[PDB]
């Protein structure tokens, strides 16, 4: 299930991201393989083991 | 004003070829030419007869 | 290790504001456009008068 | 005699990948240790306006 | 006479390599275009989006 806790702590790169059909419409049709949407803030990321 | 050729071409036999017709009856064109390239090792001929 | 969490939590705050501050301006674009729709009678009414 | 005029052979064309316009669709890279790797990946992050 | 077989065999390798070295460039042209066809939905699908 990948390592989603890492991705929001690891530094990234801002890129333009134009594409068709909204963004929830694209990710919500599982066009991407792995995904992890959540509608609030995520408590789960600060833990490390 | 087309620059057409003004004279018919010609193809006189090389004297060394005359022995080859006496042999197995075959005047390969420019027998002197092939002899040089085989010694130099060069593949392609600069221009066929 | 722990100091990254003090920094990463602060970026989580600033990104919440940059989304909200953008969200505020778009609402003024939205509700004002919603107002003009209620003051915009259909053209066959406007032309008849 | 059965004369045989000089033989001919075609010249090879020199196609290249970078010279082709199909290369514009690719960002070609060399990587000598490619045999060892199993899978690559690129994680993405999108917060919705 | 013996040298001719040496000069011929040395060019047999140069043709055996460049016939394949030229083929290696075309295969990257072919396998890359083969991949795009797997990422090329028919136009009416993209048009609906």
Swiss-Prot record, chain B:
This is Major capsid protein. It is found in: Virion; Host nucleus. The lineage of its organism: Viruses, Duplodnaviria, Heunggongvirae, Peploviricota, Herviviricetes. Belongs to the herpesviridae major capsid protein family. The gene is MCP. It comes from the Viruses. Self-assembles to form an icosahedral capsid with a T=16 symmetry, about 200 nm in diameter, and consisting of 150 hexons and 12 pentons (total of 162 capsomers). Hexons form the edges and faces of the capsid and are each composed of six MCP molecules. In contrast, one penton is found at each of the 12 vertices. Eleven of the pentons are MCP pentamers, while the last vertex is occupied by the portal complex. Homomultimer. Makes the hexons and eleven out of twelve pentons. Interacts with triplex proteins 1/TRX1 and 2/TRX2; adjacent capsomers are linked together in groups of three by triplexes, heterotrimeric complexes composed of one molecule of TRX1 and two molecules of TRX2. Interacts with scaffold protein; this interaction allows efficient MCP transport to the host nucleus. Interacts with capsid vertex component 2/CVC2. Interacts with the small capsomere-interacting protein/SCP. It comes from Human cytomegalovirus (strain AD169) (HHV-5).
